[PDB]
Amino acid sequence: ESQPDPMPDDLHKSSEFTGTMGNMKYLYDDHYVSATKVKSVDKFLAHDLIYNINDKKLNNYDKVKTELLNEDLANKYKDEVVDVYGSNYYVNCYFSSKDNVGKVTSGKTCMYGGITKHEGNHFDNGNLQNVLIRVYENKRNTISFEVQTDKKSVTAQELDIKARNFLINKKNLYEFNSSPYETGYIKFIESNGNTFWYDMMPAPGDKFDQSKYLMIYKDNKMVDSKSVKIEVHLTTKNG
Amino acid sequence: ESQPDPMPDDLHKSSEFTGTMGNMKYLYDDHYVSATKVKSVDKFLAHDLIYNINDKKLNNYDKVKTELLNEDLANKYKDEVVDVYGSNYYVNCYFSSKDNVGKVTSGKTCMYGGITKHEGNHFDNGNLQNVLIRVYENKRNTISFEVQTDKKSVTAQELDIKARNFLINKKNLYEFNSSPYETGYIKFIESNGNTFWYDMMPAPGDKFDQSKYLMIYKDNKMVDSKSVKIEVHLTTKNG
Amino acid sequence: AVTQSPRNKVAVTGGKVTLSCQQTNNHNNMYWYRQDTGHGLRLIHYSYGAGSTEKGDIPDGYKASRPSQEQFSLILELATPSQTSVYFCASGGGRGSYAEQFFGPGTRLTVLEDLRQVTPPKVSLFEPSKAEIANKQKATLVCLARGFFPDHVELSWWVNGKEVHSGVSTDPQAYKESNYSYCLSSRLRVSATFWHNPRNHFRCQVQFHGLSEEDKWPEGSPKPVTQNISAEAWGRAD
Amino acid sequence: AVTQSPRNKVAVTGGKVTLSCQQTNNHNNMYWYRQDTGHGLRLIHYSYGAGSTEKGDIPDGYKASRPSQEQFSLILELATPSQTSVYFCASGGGRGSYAEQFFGPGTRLTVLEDLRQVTPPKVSLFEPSKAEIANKQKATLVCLARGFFPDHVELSWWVNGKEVHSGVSTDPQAYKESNYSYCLSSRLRVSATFWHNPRNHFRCQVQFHGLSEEDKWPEGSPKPVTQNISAEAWGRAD
Numbered sequence: 001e002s003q004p005d006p007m008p009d010d011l012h013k014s015s016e017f018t019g020t021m022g023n024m025k026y027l028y029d030d031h032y033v034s035a036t037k038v039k040s041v042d043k044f045l046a047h048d049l050i051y052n053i054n055d056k057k058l059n060n061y062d063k064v065k066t067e068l069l070n071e072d073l074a075n076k077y078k079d080e081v082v083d084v085y086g087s088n089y090y091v092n093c094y095f096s097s098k099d100n101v102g103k104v105t106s107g108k109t110c111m112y113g114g115i116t117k118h119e120g121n122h123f124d125n126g127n128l129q130n131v132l133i134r135v136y137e138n139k140r141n142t143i144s145f146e147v148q149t150d151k152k153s154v155t156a157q158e159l160d161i162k163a164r165n166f167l168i169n170k171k172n173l174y175e176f177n178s179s180p181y182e183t184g185y186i187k188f189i190e191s192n193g194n195t196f197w198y199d200m201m202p203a204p205g206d207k208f209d210q211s212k213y214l215m216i217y218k219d220n221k222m223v224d225s226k227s228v229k230i231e232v233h234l235t236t237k238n239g
Numbered sequence: 240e241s242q243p244d245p246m247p248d249d250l251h252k253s254s255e256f257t258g259t260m261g262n263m264k265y266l267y268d269d270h271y272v273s274a275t276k277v278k279s280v281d282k283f284l285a286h287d288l289i290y291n292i293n294d295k296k297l298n299n300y301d302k303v304k305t306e307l308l309n310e311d312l313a314n315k316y317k318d319e320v321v322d323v324y325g326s327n328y329y330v331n332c333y334f335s336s337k338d339n340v341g342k343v344t345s346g347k348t349c350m351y352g353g354i355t356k357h358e359g360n361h362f363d364n365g366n367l368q369n370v371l372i373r374v375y376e377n378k379r380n381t382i383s384f385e386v387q388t389d390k391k392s393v394t395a396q397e398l399d400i401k402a403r404n405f406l407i408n409k410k411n412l413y414e415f416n417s418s419p420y421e422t423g424y425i426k427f428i429e430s431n432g433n434t435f436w437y438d439m440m441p442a443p444g445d446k447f448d449q450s451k452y453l454m455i456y457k458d459n460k461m462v463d464s465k466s467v468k469i470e471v472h473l474t475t476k477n478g
Numbered sequence: 479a480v481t482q483s484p485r486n487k488v489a490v491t492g493g494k495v496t497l498s499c500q501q502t503n504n505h506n507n508m509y510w511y512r513q514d515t516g517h518g519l520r521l522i523h524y525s526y527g528a529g530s531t532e533k534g535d536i537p538d539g540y541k542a543s544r545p546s547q548e549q550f551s552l553i554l555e556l557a558t559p560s561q562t563s564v565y566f567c568a569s570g571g572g573r574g575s576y577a578e579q580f581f582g583p584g585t586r587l588t589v590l591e592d593l594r595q596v597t598p599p600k601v602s603l604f605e606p607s608k609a610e611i612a613n614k615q616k617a618t619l620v621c622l623a624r625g626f627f628p629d630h631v632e633l634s635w636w637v638n639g640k641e642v643h644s645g646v647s648t649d650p651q652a653y654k655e656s657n658y659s660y661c662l663s664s665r666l667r668v669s670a671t672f673w674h675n676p677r678n679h680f681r682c683q684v685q686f687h688g689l690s691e692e693d694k695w696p697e698g699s700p701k702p703v704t705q706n707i708s709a710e711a712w713g714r715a716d
Numbered sequence: 717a718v719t720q721s722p723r724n725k726v727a728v729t730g731g732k733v734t735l736s737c738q739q740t741n742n743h744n745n746m747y748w749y750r751q752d753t754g755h756g757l758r759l760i761h762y763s764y765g766a767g768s769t770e771k772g773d774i775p776d777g778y779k780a781s782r783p784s785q786e787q788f789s790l791i792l793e794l795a796t797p798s799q800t801s802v803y804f805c806a807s808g809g810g811r812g813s814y815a816e817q818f819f820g821p822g823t824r825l826t827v828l829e830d831l832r833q834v835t836p837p838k839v840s841l842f843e844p845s846k847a848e849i850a851n852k853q854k855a856t857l858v859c860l861a862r863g864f865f866p867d868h869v870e871l872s873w874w875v876n877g878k879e880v881h882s883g884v885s886t887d888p889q890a891y892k893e894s895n896y897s898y899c900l901s902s903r904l905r906v907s908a909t910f911w912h913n914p915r916n917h918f919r920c921q922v923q924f925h926g927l928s929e930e931d932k933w934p935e936g937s938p939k940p941v942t943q944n945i946s947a948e949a950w951g952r953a954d
Contacts, residue, residue: 299528329530454851518756574802576822650811
């Protein structure tokens, strides 16, 4: 009830991307930043908040910078105890003005959106809302699956990451150099019919700007997990 | 009346040397060490004397080490005011035990022989003994020339260097990568019929060990300049 | 250190070129390499000490000299198109032992048919269009220096009078938009509000290197004295 | 620093190999090169920061990963004969900008058909003959390590118990004396009287590197545990 479904030639083709696809896979395969009850601690540029979150997985950072579409959104969570989830990146991750192209520092990462208030957003009895994900490979429902989550109000990002991670392993959505699929958009559909999809394939070219891609999560779009429908659509170069 | 003339297959062929001939040319083309009235100042290993001689030509060194065939010869000139002349080298020029392969230091050079007493060895009225040099290119006397020198007793080395230098320019005896000649021996003939020749072409191989070649002057063989005959013999791969 | 000179050269075919290399490290060895787009860093000639110069992987066409311990110089007698490449000189440790070599800045040499082909570039500033893609922005500003030859240029960005390095995305290398024309393009992305502050200045300066002082220009047309070009603009109201 | 590991590897065709590279310089970029006899230093893959790995000149066959900022690791899935080369990893500055890169020690990798071909070498000492040439001596001593495979060896000389570096002339590289045999030879030249002092010791030790602890030897024959071989002799009376 919002974004029109993608026209076949509006979507990206992996075979039009002559780079190392494995840079796309890095984002999704067991890769994310996770936080619970964290308060913003700094700000670089208006629309971005900085949080004290250490790299529990591989002690790579102890700081995380999530950028939001506008200062209005930044200023919003500035002093709000929240939860943080989303795929973080490194190349082009600057916190200070005196940082040249190529994040030279270490101990800090970057990301977009992924914030949701913590207050009462977690299930009454500590349950995990399951979200069904239906897969269509070449206009045919091939597989479906659910993705758990401890929030009533999650972010489409969180689900998309979780959605894709699952596929990397089961369908090899992204190989290290390529992918078996030509196209792939994850359609989000909420209770009110509102629809918004995202494109999994890298824009045709010989490069993949991880920081540029992850902006699809700049807005911090959140969804009611208990009633949202997610449809992963894929296509293969032949059939 | 001593060394038999070279058998055709006793001499070196330049076409059997697959290296940079210009390493041979470095030795002869306007390259030498010259000293007059210099006293030995140190010793590394018995058979070698070290002299305080600066690089007048290109301030590369201020010390010169000439090695002689035996300590007997070293000990001989140890405290003798002498004259020094001969082509000096650098790669593999060690003065101290703590010097690895490849002369790492600077300000010092190396050489062999080239010593002659200074006392009364220079012409009575400050003249220059001229030494005729006859050239045979393919068993045919093609050109002849003289080479001046302020000594009654010179070294065959000095003459050979001077002999060759002349040819580098006139006959392109040694090009940077090759040579027009296949073979070339400089026959020395003194007053008493004594004969000793040297080979101008690099031993067949893919390398030229400058320090190894220059040992042909290890003995410090000296000759009466006023009566010695020098015959440069050359050959060309065809005719 | 290990200096190099010249650092850029436009020579014509048939000409003799000479590139020097100095080394204030007192190293024994010195090497003369040539990096070629598509190929790797290749060894032409090297030397173990003053007065010695061995042939490397690719000696053909080049001579070299190790007249002093500090200097090693590669000589191109009959410069030809084939020698159009980037020459790197390295001092230091042994052959094939990169861990001990000290590389030099690099010399860009282009051996062209006739010097009248050397043209300074045109440089312009543009704004892409977000509406053209499903993804975001597609870079705030676009600098597009084109129609130049040979590629001896260095692009830069200067916001409010300062050279920035953050948010810039200059293409890896100049693209030959034609047999005798090169195209280049950097993209500086800033905060929209920043791009909307009419007080903010943006300068895309390209450094062009052409006919050096020693290159005699053929009488008949004006000689390209040009050095530094730039395209500027300010902020567009929010 | 910029370490490397393993520093020598004998792998069989079809096997997956992994070479790591650490960089204590906090550099952004890291590069995975392979130097090949005859060819030059070639770039396989590189990375501008943790979580990114771009294809270099020759990516084919290799994967790479930049999991941390300190580590970059090149992966050979189906090791084949073709990947037999020497891998150099470089940290530091930008691609094609050698003046800022910090090279690593180098990893020698040989991808052979079957590990039963790995043979330690024979090492002998000889004296040439001055009478064979018109020039002088032709090197005091001759060390001749031969009949080995693969070439993961390092020759050395030790006079009177000390490793010398003066007067030694070890061949630049091991020569394949056969499809599965390598020959090597250093020449240590000393003062004759020194060679004639019966009290003086001379040791030509060759370092052999073969089947690492992680390489399971096929049951049927004794496994080459060998490491360091040497040929010794003393002075021959004057």
